[PDB]
PDB file of C-alpha atoms in Angstrom:
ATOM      1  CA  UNK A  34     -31.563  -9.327 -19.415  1.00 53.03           C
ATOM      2  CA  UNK A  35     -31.559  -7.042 -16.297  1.00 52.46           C
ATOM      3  CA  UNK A  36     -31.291  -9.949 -13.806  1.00 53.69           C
ATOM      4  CA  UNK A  37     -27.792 -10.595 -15.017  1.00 52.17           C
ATOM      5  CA  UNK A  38     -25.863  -7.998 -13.417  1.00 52.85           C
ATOM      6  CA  UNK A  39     -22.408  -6.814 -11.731  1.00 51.65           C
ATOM      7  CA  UNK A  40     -21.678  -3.541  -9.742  1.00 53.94           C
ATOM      8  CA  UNK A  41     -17.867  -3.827  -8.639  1.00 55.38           C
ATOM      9  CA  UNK A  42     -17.260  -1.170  -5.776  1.00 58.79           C
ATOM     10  CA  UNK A  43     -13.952   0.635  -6.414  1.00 56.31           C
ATOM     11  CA  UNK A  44     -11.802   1.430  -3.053  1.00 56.65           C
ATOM     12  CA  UNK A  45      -8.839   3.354  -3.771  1.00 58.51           C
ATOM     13  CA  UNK A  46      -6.208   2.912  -0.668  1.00 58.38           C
ATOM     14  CA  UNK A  47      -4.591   6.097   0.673  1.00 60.37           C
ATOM     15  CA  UNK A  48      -1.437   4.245  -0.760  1.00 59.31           C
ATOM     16  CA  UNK A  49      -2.015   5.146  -4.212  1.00 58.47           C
ATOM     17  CA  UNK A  50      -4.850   8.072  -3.614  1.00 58.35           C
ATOM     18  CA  UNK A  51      -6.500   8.518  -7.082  1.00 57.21           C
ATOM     19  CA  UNK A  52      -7.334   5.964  -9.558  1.00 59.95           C
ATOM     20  CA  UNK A  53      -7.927   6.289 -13.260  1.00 58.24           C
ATOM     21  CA  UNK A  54     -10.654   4.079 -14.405  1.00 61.86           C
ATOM     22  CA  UNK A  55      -9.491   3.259 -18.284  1.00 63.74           C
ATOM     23  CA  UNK A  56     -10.168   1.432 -21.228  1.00 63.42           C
ATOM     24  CA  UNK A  57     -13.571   0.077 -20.420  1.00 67.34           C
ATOM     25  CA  UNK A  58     -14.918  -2.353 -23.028  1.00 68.07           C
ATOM     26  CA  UNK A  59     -17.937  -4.709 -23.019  1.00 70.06           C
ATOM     27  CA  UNK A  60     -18.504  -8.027 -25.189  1.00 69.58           C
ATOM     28  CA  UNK A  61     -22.383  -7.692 -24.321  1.00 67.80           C
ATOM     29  CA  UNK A  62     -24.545  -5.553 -22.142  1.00 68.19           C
ATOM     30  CA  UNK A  63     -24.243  -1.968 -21.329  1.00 72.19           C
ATOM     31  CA  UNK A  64     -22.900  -0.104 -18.197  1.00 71.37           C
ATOM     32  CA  UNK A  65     -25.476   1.938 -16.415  1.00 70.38           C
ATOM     33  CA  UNK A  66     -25.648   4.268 -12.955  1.00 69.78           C
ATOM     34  CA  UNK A  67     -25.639   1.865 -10.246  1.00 68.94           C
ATOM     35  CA  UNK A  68     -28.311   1.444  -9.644  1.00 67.99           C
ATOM     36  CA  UNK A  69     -30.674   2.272 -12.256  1.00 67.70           C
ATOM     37  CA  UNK A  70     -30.049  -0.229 -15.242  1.00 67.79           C
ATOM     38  CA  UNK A  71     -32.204   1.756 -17.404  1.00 66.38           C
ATOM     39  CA  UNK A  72     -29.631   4.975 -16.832  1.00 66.04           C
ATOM     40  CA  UNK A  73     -27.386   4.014 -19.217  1.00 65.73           C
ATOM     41  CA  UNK A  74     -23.539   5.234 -19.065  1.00 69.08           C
ATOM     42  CA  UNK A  75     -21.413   5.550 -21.961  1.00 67.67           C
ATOM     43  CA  UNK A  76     -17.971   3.545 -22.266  1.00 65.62           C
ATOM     44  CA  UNK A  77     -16.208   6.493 -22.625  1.00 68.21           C
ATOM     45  CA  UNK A  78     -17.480   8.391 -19.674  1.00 69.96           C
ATOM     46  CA  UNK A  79     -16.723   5.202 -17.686  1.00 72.24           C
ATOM     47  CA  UNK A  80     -13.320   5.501 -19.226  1.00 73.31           C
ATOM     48  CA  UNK A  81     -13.236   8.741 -17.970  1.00 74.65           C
ATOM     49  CA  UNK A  82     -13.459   8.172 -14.038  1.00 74.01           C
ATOM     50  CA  UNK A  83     -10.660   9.147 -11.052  1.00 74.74           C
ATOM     51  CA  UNK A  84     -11.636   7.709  -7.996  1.00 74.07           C
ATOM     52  CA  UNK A  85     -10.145   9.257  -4.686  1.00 70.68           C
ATOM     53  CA  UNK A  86      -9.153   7.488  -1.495  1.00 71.09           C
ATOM     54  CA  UNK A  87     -11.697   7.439   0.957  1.00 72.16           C
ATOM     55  CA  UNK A  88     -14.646   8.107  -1.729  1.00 73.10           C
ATOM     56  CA  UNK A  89     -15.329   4.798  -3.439  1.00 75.23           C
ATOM     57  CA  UNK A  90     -17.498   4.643  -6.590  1.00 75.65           C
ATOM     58  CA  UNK A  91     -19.555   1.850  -8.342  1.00 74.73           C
ATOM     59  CA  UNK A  92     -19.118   0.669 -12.177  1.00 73.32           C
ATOM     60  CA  UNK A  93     -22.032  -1.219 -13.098  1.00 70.12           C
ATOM     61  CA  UNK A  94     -23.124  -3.288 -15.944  1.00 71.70           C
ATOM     62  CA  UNK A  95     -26.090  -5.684 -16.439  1.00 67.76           C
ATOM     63  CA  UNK A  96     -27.738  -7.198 -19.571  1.00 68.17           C
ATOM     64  CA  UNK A  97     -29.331  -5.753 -21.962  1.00 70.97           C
ATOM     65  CA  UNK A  98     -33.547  -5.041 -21.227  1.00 67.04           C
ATOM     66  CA  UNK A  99     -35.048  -8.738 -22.413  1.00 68.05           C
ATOM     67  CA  UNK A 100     -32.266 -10.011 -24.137  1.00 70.00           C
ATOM     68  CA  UNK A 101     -30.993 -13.603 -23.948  1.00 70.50           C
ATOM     69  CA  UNK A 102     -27.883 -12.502 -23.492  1.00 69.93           C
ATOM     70  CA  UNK A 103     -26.064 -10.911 -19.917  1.00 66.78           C
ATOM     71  CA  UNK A 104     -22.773  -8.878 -19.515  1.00 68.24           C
ATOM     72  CA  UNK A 105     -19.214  -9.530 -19.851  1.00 70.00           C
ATOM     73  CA  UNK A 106     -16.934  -7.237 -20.165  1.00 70.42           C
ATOM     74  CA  UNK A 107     -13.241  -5.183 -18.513  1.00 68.28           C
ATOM     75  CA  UNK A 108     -11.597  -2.073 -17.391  1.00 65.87           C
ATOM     76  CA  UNK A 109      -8.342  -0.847 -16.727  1.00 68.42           C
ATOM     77  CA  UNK A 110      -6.960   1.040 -13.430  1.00 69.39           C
ATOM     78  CA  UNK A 111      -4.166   3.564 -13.363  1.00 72.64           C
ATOM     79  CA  UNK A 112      -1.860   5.227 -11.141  1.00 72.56           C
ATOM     80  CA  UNK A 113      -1.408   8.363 -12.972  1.00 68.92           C
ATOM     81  CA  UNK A 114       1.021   7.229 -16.335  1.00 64.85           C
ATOM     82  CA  UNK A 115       1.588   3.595 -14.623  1.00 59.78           C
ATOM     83  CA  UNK A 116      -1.080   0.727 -15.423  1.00 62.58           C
ATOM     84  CA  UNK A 117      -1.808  -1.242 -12.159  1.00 67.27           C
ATOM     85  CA  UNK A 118      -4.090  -4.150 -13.701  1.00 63.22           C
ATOM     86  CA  UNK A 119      -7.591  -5.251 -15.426  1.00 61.78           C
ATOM     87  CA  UNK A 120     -10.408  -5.987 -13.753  1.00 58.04           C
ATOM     88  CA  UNK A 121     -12.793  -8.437 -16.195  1.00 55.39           C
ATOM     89  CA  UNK A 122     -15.838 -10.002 -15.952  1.00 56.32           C
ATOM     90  CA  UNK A 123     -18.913 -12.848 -17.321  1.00 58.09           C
ATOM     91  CA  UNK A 124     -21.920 -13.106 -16.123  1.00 55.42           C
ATOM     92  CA  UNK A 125     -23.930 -15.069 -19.146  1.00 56.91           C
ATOM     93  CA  UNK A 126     -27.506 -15.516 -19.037  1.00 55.07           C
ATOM     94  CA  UNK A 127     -27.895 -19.462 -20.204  1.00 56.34           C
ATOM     95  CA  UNK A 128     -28.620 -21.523 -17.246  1.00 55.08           C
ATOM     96  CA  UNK A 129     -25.579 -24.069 -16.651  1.00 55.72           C
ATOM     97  CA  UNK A 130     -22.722 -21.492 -16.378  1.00 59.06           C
ATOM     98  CA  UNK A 131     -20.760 -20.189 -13.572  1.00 57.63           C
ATOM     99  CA  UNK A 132     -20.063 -16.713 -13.382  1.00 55.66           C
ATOM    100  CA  UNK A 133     -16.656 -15.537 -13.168  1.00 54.89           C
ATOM    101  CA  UNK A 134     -14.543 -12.412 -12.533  1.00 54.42           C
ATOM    102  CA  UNK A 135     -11.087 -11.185 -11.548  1.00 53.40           C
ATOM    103  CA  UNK A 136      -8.492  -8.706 -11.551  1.00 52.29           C
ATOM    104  CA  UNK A 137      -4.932  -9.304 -12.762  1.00 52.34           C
ATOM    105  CA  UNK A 138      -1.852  -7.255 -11.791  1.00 52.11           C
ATOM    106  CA  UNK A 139       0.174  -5.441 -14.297  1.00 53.46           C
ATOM    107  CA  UNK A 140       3.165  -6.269 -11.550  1.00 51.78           C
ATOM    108  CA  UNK A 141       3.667  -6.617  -8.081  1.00 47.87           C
ATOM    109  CA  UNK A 142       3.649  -2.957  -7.680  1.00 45.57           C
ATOM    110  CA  UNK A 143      -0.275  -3.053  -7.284  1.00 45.91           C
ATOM    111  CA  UNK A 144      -2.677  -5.280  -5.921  1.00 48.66           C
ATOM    112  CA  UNK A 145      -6.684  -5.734  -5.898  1.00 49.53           C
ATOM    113  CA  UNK A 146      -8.017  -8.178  -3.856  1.00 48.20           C
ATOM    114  CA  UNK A 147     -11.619  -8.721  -4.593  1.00 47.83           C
ATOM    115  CA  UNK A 148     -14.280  -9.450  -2.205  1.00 48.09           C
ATOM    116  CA  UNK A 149     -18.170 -11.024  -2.455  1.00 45.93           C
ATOM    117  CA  UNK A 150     -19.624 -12.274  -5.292  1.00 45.43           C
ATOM    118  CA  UNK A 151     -22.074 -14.829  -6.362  1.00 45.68           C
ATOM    119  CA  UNK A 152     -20.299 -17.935  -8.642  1.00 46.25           C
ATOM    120  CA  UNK A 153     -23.532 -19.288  -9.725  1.00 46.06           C
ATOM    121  CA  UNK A 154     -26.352 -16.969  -8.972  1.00 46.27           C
ATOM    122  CA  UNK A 155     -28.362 -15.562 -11.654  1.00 46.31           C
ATOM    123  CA  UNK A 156     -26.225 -12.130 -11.131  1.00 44.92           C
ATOM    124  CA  UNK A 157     -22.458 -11.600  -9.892  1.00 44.08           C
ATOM    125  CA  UNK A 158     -24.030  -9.055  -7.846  1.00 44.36           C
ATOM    126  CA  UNK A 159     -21.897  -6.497  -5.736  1.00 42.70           C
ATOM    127  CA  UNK A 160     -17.945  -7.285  -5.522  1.00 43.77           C
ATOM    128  CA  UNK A 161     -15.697  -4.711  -3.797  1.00 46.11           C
ATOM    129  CA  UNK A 162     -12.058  -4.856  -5.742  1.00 43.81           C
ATOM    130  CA  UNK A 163      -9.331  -2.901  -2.984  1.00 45.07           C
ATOM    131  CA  UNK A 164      -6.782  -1.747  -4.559  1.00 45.16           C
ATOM    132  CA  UNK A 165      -3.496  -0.640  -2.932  1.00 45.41           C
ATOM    133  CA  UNK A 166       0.072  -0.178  -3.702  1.00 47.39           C
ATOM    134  CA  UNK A 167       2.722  -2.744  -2.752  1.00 46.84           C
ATOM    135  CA  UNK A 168       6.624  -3.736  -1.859  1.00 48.07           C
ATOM    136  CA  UNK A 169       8.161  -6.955  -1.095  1.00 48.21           C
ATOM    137  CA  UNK A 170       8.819  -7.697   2.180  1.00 46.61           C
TER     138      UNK A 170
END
């Protein structure tokens, strides 16, 4: 249903400057225009995003209108040629659940620390993933 829902604000550091938002796939819902679930967005156009340092965008996804079902689903982010990680996703609608998210690191070259969130609400709601690149100190 709509009340299962994610929107995952992407904030591109000035140490990487444009992001390519890649590979999006769902297991169940659809992505829409944050934030008007009925303006559905295609997979490939989400596929098709750069986001710019300074200018953070939203990629949204929520359940399907009356289903018993909610969203779970992934992208990929890119610095240029070079794949920084995957951001993934479940939010399910069956009451008993926790909701869970994360993204993982293609290396240490990149990092995106994730921030808010709701583990056991109804929705994930609004989590801002940072993303920056990195050397060891």
């Amino acid at each position: 249903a709509y009340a299962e829902w994610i929107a995952v604000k992407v904030v591109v550091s000035k140490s990487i400057g444009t992001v390519g938002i890649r590979n999006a796939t769902l297991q169940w819902g659809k992505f829409y225009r944050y934030t008007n679930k009925d303006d559905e967005i295609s997979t490939e156009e989400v596929s098709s995003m750069n986001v710019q340092a300074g200018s953070p965008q939203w990629i949204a996804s929520c359940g399907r209108e009356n289903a018993s079902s909610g969203t779970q689903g992934s992208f990929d982010c890119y610095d240029g040629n070079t794949k920084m990680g995957t951001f993934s996703w479940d939010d399910p609608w069956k009451s008993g659940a926790t909701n869970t998210w994360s993204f993982t690191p293609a290396s240490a070259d990149y990092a995106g620390i994730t921030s808010g969130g709701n583990a056991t609400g109804t929705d994930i709601g609004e989590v801002t993933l940072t993303l920056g690149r990195f050397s060891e100190n």
